[PDB]
Structure formats: structure tokens, C-alpha cells
Amino acid sequence: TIPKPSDQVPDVDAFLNKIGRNCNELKDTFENNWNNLFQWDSKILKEKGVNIQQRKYILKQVHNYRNNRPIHEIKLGKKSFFGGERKRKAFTAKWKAEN
Amino acid sequence: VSAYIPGEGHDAQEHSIVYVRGGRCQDLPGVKYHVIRGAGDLSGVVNRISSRSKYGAKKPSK
Amino acid sequence: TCGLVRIRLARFGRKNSPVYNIVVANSRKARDAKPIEVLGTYVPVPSPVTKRELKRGVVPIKDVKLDFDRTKYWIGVGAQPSETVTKLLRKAGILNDAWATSKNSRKVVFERMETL
Amino acid sequence: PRKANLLKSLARGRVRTSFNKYNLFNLYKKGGVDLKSKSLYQQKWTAKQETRAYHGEHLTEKRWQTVFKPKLDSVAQLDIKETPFLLQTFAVLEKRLDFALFRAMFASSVRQARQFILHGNVRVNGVKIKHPSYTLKPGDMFSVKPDKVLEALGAKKPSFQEALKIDKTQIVLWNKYVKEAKTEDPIKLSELEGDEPKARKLINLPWQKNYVYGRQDPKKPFFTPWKPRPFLSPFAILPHHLEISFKTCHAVYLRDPVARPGQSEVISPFDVPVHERAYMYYLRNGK
Amino acid sequence: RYENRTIYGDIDFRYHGVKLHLRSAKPGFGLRVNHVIFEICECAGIKDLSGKVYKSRNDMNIAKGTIEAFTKAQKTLDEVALGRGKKLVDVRKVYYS
Amino acid sequence: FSRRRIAYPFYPFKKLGRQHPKKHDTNLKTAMRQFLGPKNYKGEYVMNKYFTVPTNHVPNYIKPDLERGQSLEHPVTKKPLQLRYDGTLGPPPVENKRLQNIFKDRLLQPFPSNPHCKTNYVLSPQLKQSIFEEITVEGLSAQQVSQKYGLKIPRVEAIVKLVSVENSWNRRNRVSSDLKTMDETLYRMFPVFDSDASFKRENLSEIPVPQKTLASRFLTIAESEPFGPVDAAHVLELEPAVETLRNLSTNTKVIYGELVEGERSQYKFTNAKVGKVGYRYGSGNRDNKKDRRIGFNKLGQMVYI
Amino acid sequence: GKGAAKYGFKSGVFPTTRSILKSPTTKQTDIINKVKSPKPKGVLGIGYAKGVKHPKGSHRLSPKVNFIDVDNLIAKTVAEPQSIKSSNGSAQKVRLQKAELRRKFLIEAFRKEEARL
RNA sequence: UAGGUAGUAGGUUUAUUAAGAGUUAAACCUAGCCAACGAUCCAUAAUCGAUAAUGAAAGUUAGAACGAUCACGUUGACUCUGAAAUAUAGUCAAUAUCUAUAAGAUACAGCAGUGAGGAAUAUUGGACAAUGAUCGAAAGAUUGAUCCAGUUACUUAUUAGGAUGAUAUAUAUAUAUAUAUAAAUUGAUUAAAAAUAAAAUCCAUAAAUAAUUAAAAUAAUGAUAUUAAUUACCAUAUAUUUAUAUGGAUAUAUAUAUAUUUUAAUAGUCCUGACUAAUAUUUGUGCCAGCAGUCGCGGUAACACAAAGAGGGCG
Ligand SMILES: [Mg+2]
Ligand SMILES: [Mg+2]
Ligand SMILES: [Mg+2]
Ligand SMILES: [Mg+2]
Ligand SMILES: [Mg+2]
Ligand SMILES: [Mg+2]
Ligand SMILES: [Mg+2]
Ligand SMILES: [Mg+2]
Ligand SMILES: [Mg+2]
Ligand SMILES: [Mg+2]
Ligand SMILES: [Mg+2]
Ligand SMILES: [Mg+2]
Ligand SMILES: [Mg+2]
Ligand SMILES: [Mg+2]
Ligand SMILES: [Mg+2]
Ligand SMILES: [Mg+2]
Ligand SMILES: [Mg+2]
Ligand SMILES: [Mg+2]
Ligand SMILES: [Mg+2]
Ligand SMILES: [Mg+2]
Ligand SMILES: [Mg+2]
Ligand SMILES: [Mg+2]
Ligand SMILES: [Mg+2]
Ligand SMILES: [Mg+2]
Ligand SMILES: [Mg+2]
Ligand SMILES: [Mg+2]
Ligand SMILES: [Mg+2]
Ligand SMILES: [Mg+2]
Ligand SMILES: [Mg+2]
């Protein structure tokens, strides 16, 4: 079932921008067709030639949109500036020595 | 170890890499081993037609 | 999920062909290690229907042999079920709508019943 | 499975499960299996040779050994002759789908039956099977595609040229007969190369109206008006453990073959001593 | 021989060197004995037999010992019954298998 | 002492003597040719006894011991022939008394070397039909039918099953002409089951033999003390043989899950006692052993259990 | 595989089935009677003989068997709410329902166990 | 390894502990305790099963894999927090590498992987889709647990083609068709075979090529994945999987008459004197070359060495 485009994100491109995680640079693989994006599934996306992680994310965000849950770029997890829990002790010491 | 060397003519020097297995040369006393013949510097026995795997001999391939 | 005692699925069987072993276990002990009490089994691959059967309109079944009374007891003493296990229990009719999360939350075709 | 190679040679009088002409001859000229002037081991070996050639030549030795059951089966009548217990050594193979199909006479051989079921023609309780190692339970139907059954029990469908050549000779014989009758319809094969309808149009004998000798329905995989196989009689042994209906080509596997006071239901071309020797061998794996 | 197929009891007999041990057998269980014993049984009509030779396994002495055991070590049930003055039923036969 | 013995016929045949260098013929091949007789332009070995199919309800099984390897009969008259000093065939000088005087049992004995293997009889279609009617319309029990006719109850059930299938095929018009002809030929080949002939009737008191009976026991009862079948059964710790024969002749909470419009499958929950339900821990992996268990699916797919 | 024939040819093991009531109940009268009967002496005796002493620090007898009053146990583990009608909000209602369900199940289980034994 | 033992054996008390106890610490007594049915001492070894192997069984063997228990996370000691730690933590020392040179950091027995050792044991893979685990109110974040694929005949299993098949021409409502010319491989000249083996012939099926649609998972999410499976030009519409009728797909003759993708087959390796299954024979070598589990074989007639032929196992 197709949903309506909202005021905040009325376009496919706008939706892509909203969701993020480098979902931009994906306006060529499918053109700005609202119905097209929503009806399309995983296999179709794979055939077109998108990534696995990107494919997973888009579908999830589509689903959220359908259910009217707030879509936004929940960024992927990042290691600490110093290091991963294991490497910190040494890295931190090195950083201190440098500075 | 005193190892037997089977087959016709062999190729073994005073330093050759050789693999030993646990057979026994029955007529020679005090030698309780065989050099396995396909592997190492010990080469496969030449112009062997019968029982080729028992020596090194590869399949002639027409 | 939370807890020390937890009702969850331990994996069994071979590659590309899982069967599950509904257990109650410690949270710390491993996924396929020996648990406190095995309550039941669960094969996720549904029983395959015939072409004629499909045409008629008969749904596949997922077999879930399960000690009901034991499971209930374990729930009572406060052993939290996993996301899949709790769903299974709800489907059976042990647990209420209370356990259903927001993601789960659609007209019903066939209603539940006990049979022999 | 073990590859088919020299199964029906004459210098080894091995009696295989088949309706082959060479197999028939082997069966004919074997007599018994001679166990005289042999050691115990030698006797056991000769038993193994003969008995396994018939019972599961396609099976590998190790595989066979694994399947081989020591505990034989029997039935007490509780109402005389001595039951042949040890004929049951190869009772376990009749439980197989392939063997059951062969017994039913839905195949010429065990190999052929195996091929049929691989190709997905046999069914057992509706469900189609592509697995010879499938084992029937008592009460299970099994059903071969009727065309394949007909092919198995029918004659070999001739090539067109061969059929035409046969027709030519028949025509000549007919002409000779009519000449003889007078005293007290030709075909040129070189011209008529491969026009089947033309050949049909040409031909008109009393015993075949148009169709060439071997091709009344070329699209069917067997001989013309269906007739039986060239030496079908001496191998048509109707089994006890199967109930058969040749119209539909269905067959109920009703029992696991079992030995009575009179007889065994394991159909074999070997006397009981041979089967005893085989059993002795396979208990110990020839120790 | 019991039922025209096996020996009556489990016999244990010494002939010179060879120590024989021949157990009776349920019907269908074949001849499972030393090759000489087997040969003798085939000729003497014994279908079912288990047993094992200890000490000497001298073929000739086995052959001599085993026939001696058969003739001598065996007692038929009827003879035993007569000696003791009792009924000596075979339970399997009574049952009808 | 065993050699490799080339399997020549036990019976006597015209061996090779000398022959033209190029032909390369073997004695076995010659023997086979002789057995076959001469082959037609068509391909048929007409003179061989065993070529044509019997239309007699009398199976033409093999008697190589009786006819002494001489298989060749004249097709029209079924009279025996031999291979003379010339290549032409002709009648035998001495007649065979073995082929003339043959028993009932040996006519139904497909292989000469195995007396025990015999052919089972074929049921006449009318009889099968009558059985089917009895079971369905008249509503008689299968045991009574078996007693009447002389078949076994599983056999009767199998027959019934086959009859209904045949009827369905006839309704659909699947039973082709070629199939019918084949069925007729098969019927003609095999001997018919007679319901009156006592020797032909199947023995209906055959129970299967258990383990406890086979292991022989003996009891020293007093000389006069009686000891019947019941007593023997009691000693062995079984039910009596008659009772077992009679037996041969003759709950758990299950829930189903709710089915919402979208979801594709139900959830059947059967009850099960704890300590008896699961997949056990530290069981024997049998997959790399040759005693591995291979089952089959509902769709006939081969599946590792 | 050889030793599985002891356990009915059962390869692999289950964990021990865990007793719902972990002591004998008060309703199990026969057990109580057995416990309280005069303990034997002599050859097949249990405790200390009347005349004979026991080690200074140690107790003379064995400790007494705590018989479960099942109703009391139920009350303690699974108390019904005193504030009966205080209930607003969806999450709170859900929690209350869950609690009720847990009460039901554990009550049933214990009572069943008591009856079952 | 024949004597061992001096907190040793036992009693009385105090501390420490949640709590017993020469478990530690302290104090005071008694003279014990263990041992040739093996003490003390040394050496070796992670232990075990409803696991695996083998046996008729009692047993014996393994302890890879599945699971349960222990101990360790380069070596040794101690401390802190804690219900529980001599923690893969911290402290100090020991050994060996890193820079950043500092009352530094690291230690792959986590996963890949490298060098070494060795007869010998894999990818510097993909995904969090499933099942678990940690954090979070949730949104969802992490996850070399895990699930998947990769390499490796290490193991097991299923397939890895069936039926017919001994010649080639030429002549002339029946039917044993019959003559004639030609040819015919390695052996061998008859019980010496190789050989129904080939080649042909009939019939499929895999793979391919197209179309379709699961299931592992549902609220949605599928790494595996050119997924398994099914159909053979697709769909609907009747009956009981088969059969027929429609709708459209298609192409030549002159909208409707016959058709409907394609299509195979390929095994080693050991052995043939007896134990030990292998009789069709022949050549070479000449106590040499070589064979051999065991007895033995080779000195011109070698069934044993090296080969051809034929044969027997397992595959
Ligand atoms: Mg964030
Ligand atoms: Mg070779
Ligand atoms: Mg939580
Ligand atoms: Mg103290
Ligand atoms: Mg101490
Ligand atoms: Mg002190
Ligand atoms: Mg000691
Ligand atoms: Mg150690
Ligand atoms: Mg050990
Ligand atoms: Mg292990
Ligand atoms: Mg390991
Ligand atoms: Mg540690
Ligand atoms: Mg290290
Ligand atoms: Mg340490
Ligand atoms: Mg690693
Ligand atoms: Mg190296
Ligand atoms: Mg996850
Ligand atoms: Mg990774
Ligand atoms: Mg390896
Ligand atoms: Mg294999
Ligand atoms: Mg030649
Ligand atoms: Mg394919
Ligand atoms: Mg030899
Ligand atoms: Mg031999
Ligand atoms: Mg050699
Ligand atoms: Mg000697
Ligand atoms: Mg020579
Ligand atoms: Mg040689
Ligand atoms: Mg050769």
C-alpha cells in the first residue's frame, strides 16, 4: 500500500537526504518516483546495484515512514577518539607522550 | 636409522632429503625401514608400469 | 532481554536446517550449552503443503511441542522470555497481549482452540 | 553406486536381476553353484560371488555390509517341511523401492527400475520419489508411469530404416506365397530414405495395413501394437509380498518378504546352502 | 540331535589335546564353528551350532573329538526322562513358536 | 582347491573344432547360439521354447536339467528338436520321459536350482471385484472375507485399494489399449487363484516368530503333570499364540495458534512432559559415520535426520 | 553408545528436572510420620545411644525437616495487592496484568505440585 | 623409592571466617599418624559421558568432534573492588619485542593470517537475515559469540545411463524365410578366450536455455543467493495427479490447419605360489637385477623378480 508524501519530505531525494548514511549518490539508480521507491523490495534493489547495508537501511526507513515513526539519520556506532577499549591504554599513553 | 631403498636404480647422494617409513628389509639384518620413493630428493622409479604407487611412478598419460 | 533466568531458543540440528530447543537457562551460560530445563522444541521451517491443498486454502503449520505447565511455572517465578520465545508463547496462548511490544501490535481469520 | 560393467558375460555365469537374453542363457547353463572340492573360505567366496551378483550388484560392498541385517525373519503356522531360514539374507533389499519395482515387473531389470525412479516416474502414496534407497513400509502403494512399464515389458522399438528393411522382406515373402498359390507390392529402400508417411502409404499387407513393421505409433517409446518382451516367460515370477495391478501399474507393498515352512518369499535363483555360505561370510565380513 | 537341526545341550568335551565347546543354537542361527566341525555337521545334518575349540586345534583330532562328543556327550531328552522318571518338556514346541 | 572356472554349459553341446582364422569365435558363444536357435530377418529367435509367451495359465519356466540343454521346439506344434551333424535342425531320435512326467510344484518353480522359490498365484478380476463389493457394499469384515476366499487380510486390503484405483482410472479413461493388452498377457502367463482348492489357499494361522520363543527352554515337570500351550506361554512370559493370532487378524493437549490475515502459517503446540521433549545435549554425532540416518520428507526429498 | 543401553538407548542427556516444591509439604502426612517415629538403635541405628555422649561443638541430633505450608508459601512469594484499585496509565496497566498472570501461574503450579505428590 | 612423618597424629583455648577443621596465626598439653592390600619419594597424564572406536560379551582403547567438569590466558607472587578473583584488572618483579623513552606500552591459548617446528591440519572471506549476548526509556548501537559461504576426498551419504546389440550387401491373414558373394580385430585352433565388450539402434534424464515461485521471518529486516523447488509457450475452468475445453502467444500454405527451447556421459588403484579370491598363455632376466606381512621366490621350464595377454578384489 502506497503512502502519501508529507510536507517535510515530499520527494524521494528529500527522503534519501533525511535518512542519510550516504543514501545520497543514489538518485541515478532509481529516479525520483515516490511510488517506485516504496513498492520496490530487496531483490529489485540488489538487481539495480545498491549495497547490502544501504538496501537494509532504506527498507527500514520506508517501513518507519509507512508506520509514521520519526525517520532521521541515526548514525552508525563510532570508536572512541583514543581507541577501542582494548587499544586505548597504549594509544592514550602514546598521545600523552606526543603532547 | 638404516633404511632400505626399493626399486631398480635409485638416486640418493650423501645429503639427499629422504622420507622414511616403517617397513623392514627381511634379508638384511639391522635395517627396519624403507625410504618412501615418490617424495623428497629420492625420485620415482623409472619406467615402472606395474604397482606404480608403491614406487614414485606417475601415470604415463599416453 | 533482562534477567538471570531466561526462557530462550538453543539452536540444534545441522547447517541450513535449524531446529530449536526451547530452554530456561542462565543469562551468562552459552547459547547451545546445557541449560536448567528444556521445555520444548521448535522447528521454524513450516510443514510443506500439497499443490491441491494450497489451492483449497490450507495454511502450513510450525510444530512446537512444549511442556505448558512447566513453562507457566517458569514464567511465574520470573524467568523472562526472549523476543521470539515470548512471541511463540503469546501465539500458543500462555502469555497475554501485555507482553506484545510496540513493533508487533489486521483481522483474525482463525481463532485459537485446545483440541485432543 | 557401483558401475555396470560385464554384468552379462558368459565366461562368468553370473545370474543378474534382469530379463536379458544373455542373462537368461547364463541362468540356463549354470546348473548349480559347485561347492565341492573347495575349502570353507573358497565356498564362502563362491557363494558371495553368485548370490551378490543377483542380489544388489549396483550396491557397493561396504554399503551392502552396512545395510546387511543378521536377524532374519520367519512365521510359525501353529497347525512337515523345514523352513529355509537363510534364504532371507537378501530380504532387506526387497524393502528397497528399486527392488520392489523390479519384482512388480514395472522394469526389465533392477538397474532400469533405478533409472526410472531417478527420472521421477515412480510414485509411492502419491508423492513422487527420485531415490532408489527409499524403503517401502507395509501398506505403501507404488506406481510407475504406464508408458515406462510398457517399454520395460515391450519389445525394442525399431529404427525406421530397419523397420523398412523388415517390411521389404515380408513383402517379398508375401509375393512368393501368392506366386506359389497361383502355381498350385514392391518397395525400393534406396529411394525411400526417411519419409515415414510415404512408407506408410506405400505399404499394405493383410497383417499390417499401413504402419511399417516397427512403427504404428512412432511417438510412443515401444513396439507398435504392444507385444511382450522377447524372453519374458522364464523371468515372470509373480511375487508374494507385492499385490500388483498391471492395468494402472500400481502395486501395494503388503509385506516384508518372510520364510514359511514350505518356502521363502525372497525370489532367488540359488539353493539354500549357497545362501547359508553367503550369510556365514557376511556375519564376519569374511574374517 | 534336537529337532533334527542341533545338539541337545551345551556340550564341553575333551578329546586328547583339543578341548571342545559346542553350544546349542536357536533355529536360523547357522553353523558358527571351526571349519572341520562345520564340515562334519554338514554331513551329519546339524543345521545350527555355536562353539569354539581350545588348546590343540589339530584338524584330525578335532574331527575325531567332535563325532565322539556328538555320540557320547549328548543325552536325548527322552533318555534323560526315562532315567530320572520325569516329564521333560520342550517349552518352545509346546508354545508352537 | 579352486580354479577360475569358465562357465561352460553342464549339458553337452557342439564345440568348436577347427575354424577359419578370421572368425575368432568362442565355445560359450557357440553354446549360446545353439540354445537360441536361428534368428529371423525380424530379430526373433523363434525356435527357442522360451521366446514366446504362454497363453495357458501355465508358466513356461526353465527346465535345463530335464531337457538336457536342448531348448529348441517347433513353434507351431511345440514339438522338440535337436542340432544334427548337418547345420539343419530335426526331431530327436529318443523321446524325453523327464519333460513328459513333471510335477505340480516344479511347474511353478521359476529357477531349477532353488525349490523354495515358487510363483504366487494371480487373482481373477471377477474374484477381486466380488471381494471389493463384499468389503464396501455388503460391509463385511476383512477377516471373514479372508476366511471365505483363502487370502491374507493385508493382501485383501491391498486388492481393495487396487480395485478402487482401477475404477478411478476407468472413469478418467486412462487405461489405454496397450496397457489392457499387457494386463491380459500377464494374466495368461500366471496361474489363477482357486478359492476352493485347499492347497492353493493361503495359510491364515501364520503368526511372526518372536525372540523369546526361539531361545529354547526345557522343564523337568513330574511324569504325570500336564503342560499345555498356555503353561509354556506363561513360562516364557508371553501372551498365548492363539491370542497373538487373533490380535493380528483384528489424549494429549494440542493448541493451534491464531491466524491473522497477513501471516502465512499456523503454530501447532502439542503438550510434552519435561525430561522427555528436547534435543538432547552431548548426543552422538552420526553424520561422519556410515551408520548415519537418512530419512525422507513429506515431498519425497531425501533429508538427513 | 555402549553405555546408552542403561538409559534406554538415549544418546545425549537432559538436565535434571528441577523440583517445583523443594521440600516435603505439610500435607504429606506419611513422610512426617516417618520422620517423627522413634529412631532405631543397636546395629542398624541412626543417632546417638542414650548413655553415650557426642562431640562438644557438634549437635547431637540432625536438623529438623522444614515442612512447607504451601498456602503460606503462596502468600509470601505471591502476595495479592493491598492497594486494590490504584491503576492509571497504559504501561502500569500492562505491568499489573503481567503480575496477575505470574500470580496465577505460580499459584497453580504450587497447588498442582502439592496435589500431584 | 622402604621406611616416611614433626603441624607431623590427637587433645585444650584464642584470634580469622558466613561456617567445620593444625587451613592459616598464637599459646599449652598428650605421643601419635601413615606404611609390602605399597607408605613417603620420583616419573608420566587434564578428567569424564547416555561421546567415539572395537569386541560375542566381560572388557580394552581414545578423550579430535558433541556435551559435563577442571585448570590456565607469556612466568611468579601480592593487593583492591566484590556475594564470589591470588581476576586476561591493578601492583611489583621475571622473559622477549615496540616506540613515545615514560614511577611507559605490548604478550593472538578471540578470529583471520605470518614465520618456525612437523609426516600433517584451512580464508588476512560475507552478514548481523536467524539464535543468543552487552548498552539504551525508546529509537537502534555493538557483536571474528553466532550464522553463512571459502580451502582441504579427513569422514559419511546420494548420484556419476538404461533397454536392445555379434556382420555386410545382392536375389526371390502369410510366416521355422532361403540362397549366393564379400569381410571378419588381439590371442588361440578348441572347452582359449578377450567379446555384449565395442560400434550401431530405441528411450529418457542431468546440465544448459527461458519462465515462475517458496522456506529459513516477519510489523519490517534474507548474509547465504545466478537460493531449493516447479514448469517446459503461458493463463483459467471443469471433473477425478491425469484428461479435455477455452483465452491469448506464435508461423508457413490458402482470422485457422499442422507444430512448439535443447540435450550428453566419463575410474582409478592393489593383487593372481600357499596362507588368500584370481588355470589362456607368452616374453625378458638367470641366486643378478629385484621381490617379500609370513613360509619363501631368483643357479635357463620363474604361476613369486620385470613386462604383455587373460583374470580376481575394492572403488
Ligand atoms: Mg546516537
Ligand atoms: Mg599401475
Ligand atoms: Mg531490556
Ligand atoms: Mg580448632
Ligand atoms: Mg596441614
Ligand atoms: Mg601452633
Ligand atoms: Mg606407590
Ligand atoms: Mg600434564
Ligand atoms: Mg587415561
Ligand atoms: Mg574433545
Ligand atoms: Mg580442539
Ligand atoms: Mg588464571
Ligand atoms: Mg602467547
Ligand atoms: Mg599465571
Ligand atoms: Mg586463530
Ligand atoms: Mg617446515
Ligand atoms: Mg544480532
Ligand atoms: Mg567481521
Ligand atoms: Mg587432514
Ligand atoms: Mg562414498
Ligand atoms: Mg591372432
Ligand atoms: Mg537443470
Ligand atoms: Mg603370490
Ligand atoms: Mg585362490
Ligand atoms: Mg611388487
Ligand atoms: Mg619350512
Ligand atoms: Mg623365461
Ligand atoms: Mg610377476
Ligand atoms: Mg593385461
Q: Decide: helix, strand or coil at residue G23.
A: coil
Measure Cα distances from C108 to C103, D255, F262 in Å.
18, 48, 9
Contact partners, residue D71, CB within 8 Å, separation at least 6: none
* Cβ–Cβ pairs < 8 A, chains D and E: 23
How many Å from the CA of G58 to C1' of H8?
Answer: 26
Q: Decide: helix, strand or coil at residue E31.
A: strand
Measured distance CA(C12)–CA(A14) in Å, rounded: 46
Amino acid identity of D99? F
Please count the helices (runs of H) and the strands (runs of E) in chain G: 3, 0
C-beta atoms surrounding D65 within 10 Å: 13
Residue bearing cell 508411469: D145
Measured distance CA(A17)–CA(E92) in Å, rounded: 90
Measured distance CA(D241)–CA(B18) in Å, rounded: 63
- Tell me if chain C has a CB within 8 Å of the CB of G48: no
Which cell numbers in the block locate residue D277?
555360505
Amino acid identity of F117? C
Beta bridge partners of G25: G68
Sheet with C5-14: strands ordered across:
C37-42, C17-26, C5-14, C80-81
Residue bearing cell 577359419: F20
Sheet with D242-245: strands ordered across:
D140-143, D250-253, D242-245
Task: Give me ligand 9 centre to Cα G2, in Å.
Answer: 19
Contact partners, residue F43, CB within 8 Å, separation at least 6: D230
Residue D85 DSSP symbol? G
The answer to whether D247 and F180 have CB atoms below 8 angstroms apart is yes
Task: Give me ligand 1 centre to Cα A75, in Å.
Answer: 6
C-beta atoms surrounding G41 within 10 Å: 12
**How large is the greatest C-alpha to C-alpha distance in chain F, in angstroms?**
91
Strand H footprint nucleotides (protein C-beta < 7 Å): 12-13, 20-21, 49-56, 58-60, 65-68, 90, 100-102, 104-106, 119, 126-134, 138-143, 145-149, 154-167, 170-178, 183-197, 201-206, 214-224, 226, 229-230, 239-243, 267-271, 275-280, 289-297, 306-308, 311-315
Measured distance CA(E7)–CA(E1) in Å, rounded: 5
Q: Which residues of F touch C70 (CB under 8 A)?
A: 274
The answer to whether D11 and F28 have CB atoms below 8 angstroms apart is yes
How many Å from the CA of A41 to C1' of H77?
Answer: 63
Q: How far is CA C15 from the centre of its chain?
A: 21
Amino acid identity of G102? R
Amino acid identity of C11? R
Beta bridge partners of G115: none
> Which of D281, D69, F218, D73 has its CA nearest to residue E27?
D73
Question: Would residue C8 be called left, alpha or beta, if left means φ above 0 and alpha means ψ between -120 and 50 degrees?
Answer: beta
Which cell numbers in the block locate residue A24?
545520497
Q: Does G103 contact C76 at a Cβ distance shorter than 8 Å?
A: yes
Q: What is the crossing angle of helices F153-172 and F125-133, to 10°?
A: 100
> Which of D61, D65, D31 has its CA nearest to residue D279?
D65
Measured distance CA(F57)–CA(F46) in Å, rounded: 21
The answer to whether F165 and D142 have CB atoms below 8 angstroms apart is no
Measured distance CA(G92)–CA(G83) in Å, rounded: 14
Rounded to 10 degrees, the C-alpha dihedral E66/E71/E75/E76 comes to 110
Closest nucleotide (C1' vs CA) to C11 is H131
Pairing of strands B19-21, B34-36: antiparallel
The answer to whether D95 and D39 have CB atoms below 8 angstroms apart is no
- Minimum-distance ligand to the CA of F23? 21
> Which of D222, D12, D10, D263 has its CA nearest to residue D108?
D222
Residue D255 DSSP symbol? -
Q: Which residues of F touch D220 (CB under 8 A)?
A: 178
Amino acid identity of G105? F
The answer to whether F16 and F23 have CB atoms below 8 angstroms apart is no
> Which of D25, D226, D236 has its CA nearest to residue F53?
D236
Measured distance CA(B48)–CA(B58) in Å, rounded: 9
The continuous run of DSSP H or E covering D98 comes out as helix D97-104
> Which of F221, F109, F206, F105 has its CA nearest to residue F155?
F206
Residue F135 DSSP symbol? I
C-beta atoms surrounding A71 within 10 Å: 18
The answer to whether F191 and F119 have CB atoms below 8 angstroms apart is yes
Measured distance CA(A43)–CA(A36) in Å, rounded: 14
Which cell numbers in the block locate residue E89?
518338556
> Which of D34, D243, D36 has its CA nearest to residue D141?
D243
Beta bridge partners of D74: D259
Q: Over B13-26, what HEC string results?
A: CCCCCCEEECCCCC
The answer to whether F89 and F82 have CB atoms below 8 angstroms apart is yes
DSSP string, C77-114: HT-EEPHHHHHHHHHHTSS-GGG--TTT---EEE--EE
Contact partners, residue D124, CB within 8 Å, separation at least 6: D97, D134, D136, D140, D141, D142, D143, F300
Measure Cα distances from G31 to D179, F273, G24, G28, G72 in Å.
116, 26, 8, 6, 20
Measured distance CA(C92)–CA(C110) in Å, rounded: 13
3-state DSSP helix/strand/coil percent for chain F, to nearest 5? 30, 10, 55
Length of chain G: 117
The answer to whether D76 and E96 have CB atoms below 8 angstroms apart is yes
Residue bearing cell 533355529: E27
The answer to whether D121 and D144 have CB atoms below 8 angstroms apart is yes
Measured distance CA(D40)–CA(G90) in Å, rounded: 88
Contact partners, residue D269, CB within 8 Å, separation at least 6: D15, D27, D54, F110, F111, F113, F114, F117
Measured distance CA(F202)–CA(D240) in Å, rounded: 10
> Which of F165, F139, F161, F142 has its CA nearest to residue F153?
F142
Which cell numbers in the block locate residue F90?
530335426
C-beta atoms surrounding A27 within 10 Å: 14
> Which of B7, B19, B21, B12 has its CA nearest to residue B49?
B7
Residue F285 DSSP symbol? P
DSSP string, F168-227: HHHHHT---HHHHHHHHHHHHHSPBPPSS-TTTS--TT-EEP-HHHHS--EEEEESS---
Beta bridge partners of D141: D252
Pairing of strands C61-63, F266-270: parallel
Q: Which residues of F touch G8 (CB under 8 A)?
A: none
Measured distance CA(G99)–CA(A43) in Å, rounded: 45
C-beta atoms surrounding D285 within 10 Å: 10
Encode D33-51: b = buried (16+ Cβ within 10 Å), e = exposed: bebeeeebeebbbbbbebb
The answer to whether F31 and F64 have CB atoms below 8 angstroms apart is no
Length of chain D: 287
> Which of B44, B41, B43 has its CA nearest to residue B17?
B41
Residue bearing cell 572341520: E36
The answer to whether D62 and F290 have CB atoms below 8 angstroms apart is yes
Which cell numbers in the block locate residue F202?
493361503
The continuous run of DSSP H or E covering D118 comes out as helix D110-118
> Which of D269, D273, D278, D275 has its CA nearest to residue D31?
D269
F11 min Cα distance to partner chain E (Å): 28
The answer to whether F294 and D63 have CB atoms below 8 angstroms apart is no
Measured distance CA(G70)–CA(G21) in Å, rounded: 9
Question: Would residue D152 be called left, alpha or beta, if left means φ above 0 and alpha means ψ between -120 and 50 degrees?
Answer: alpha
Which cell numbers in the block locate residue A38?
516504496
C-beta atoms surrounding D112 within 10 Å: 20
| Resolution of this entry, Å | 5.0
Measure Cα distances from B56 to B16, B24, B44, F20, F228 in Å.
16, 19, 4, 47, 75
Read off φ and ψ for residue D66, nearest 5 degrees. -60, -45
Beta bridge partners of F72: F48
C-beta atoms surrounding F166 within 10 Å: 21
Task: Give me ligand 14 centre to Cα D71, in Å.
Answer: 59
Q: Over D111-151, what HEC string results?
A: HHHHHHHHCCCCECCCCECCCCCCECCCCEEEECCHHHHHH
Rounded to 10 degrees, the C-alpha dihedral D55/D61/D64/D68 comes to 100
The continuous run of DSSP H or E covering B36 comes out as strand B34-36
> Which of E43, D135, D167, D112 has its CA nearest to residue F293?
D135
> Which of D6, D22, D16 has its CA nearest to residue D57?
D16
Select from D72, D76, D85 the Cβ nearest to the Cβ of E97.
Answer: D76
Task: Give me ligand 16 centre to Cα G23, in Å.
Answer: 64
> Which of D150, D243, D242, D250 has its CA nearest to residue F128?
D243
Determine whether D152 is exposed, middle or buried from the number of CB atoms within 10 Å of its CB (0-12, 13-18, 19+). Answer: buried
CA angle in degrees (0–180, nearest 5) for C35-C39-C43: 100
Measured distance CA(B43)–CA(B35) in Å, rounded: 11
Which cell numbers in the block locate residue D243?
499385490
Determine whether D79 is exposed, middle or buried from the number of CB atoms within 10 Å of its CB (0-12, 13-18, 19+). Answer: exposed
DSSP string, D179-206: HHHHH-----TTT-SS-HHHHHHH---S
Measured distance CA(C86)–CA(C6) in Å, rounded: 11
- Tell me if chain F has a CB within 8 Å of the CB of D40: no
Amino acid identity of B4? Y
Amino acid identity of C58? V
The answer to whether D124 and D140 have CB atoms below 8 angstroms apart is yes
Residue bearing cell 495487592: G81
Residue of E1, E34, E47, E93 best to disrupt the D interface, most CBs of D under 10 A:
E47
**How large is the greatest C-alpha to C-alpha distance in chain B, in angstroms?**
42
End-to-end CA gap in chain D: 25
How many Å from the CA of G60 to C1' of H27?
Answer: 30
How many Å from the CA of D181 to C1' of H181?
Answer: 31
Q: How far is CA F211 from the centre of its chain?
A: 26
F74 min Cα distance to partner chain D (Å): 16
E55 min Cα distance to partner chain D (Å): 21
Measured distance CA(E11)–CA(E13) in Å, rounded: 6
Measured distance CA(G47)–CA(G28) in Å, rounded: 24
Select from F264, F274, F303 the Cβ nearest to the Cβ of C59.
Answer: F264
Beta bridge partners of E90: F218
Measured distance CA(D81)–CA(A88) in Å, rounded: 91
Residue F136 DSSP symbol? I
Which cell numbers in the block locate residue D203?
505399404
> Which of C63, C113, C49 has its CA nearest to residue F270?
C63
Measure Cα distances from D68 to D61, D74, D260, D282, G3 in Å.
10, 17, 21, 8, 24
Measured distance CA(B2)–CA(B20) in Å, rounded: 10
The answer to whether D207 and D171 have CB atoms below 8 angstroms apart is no
Q: Does F221 contact E87 at a Cβ distance shorter than 8 Å?
A: yes
DSSP string, F4-53: ------SS------S--TTS---HHHHHHHHHH-PBPSSS-B-SBTTTSP
Breaks (C-N over 2.5 A) in chain F follow: 250
Pairing of strands D75-76, C61-63: unpaired
Length of chain A: 99
- Answer whether F touches G (≥3 Cβ pairs < 8 Å): yes
Measured distance CA(G86)–CA(G97) in Å, rounded: 13
The answer to whether D90 and D99 have CB atoms below 8 angstroms apart is no
3-state DSSP helix/strand/coil percent for chain G, to nearest 5? 40, 5, 55
Contact partners, residue F28, CB within 8 Å, separation at least 6: D10, D11, F6, F7, F8
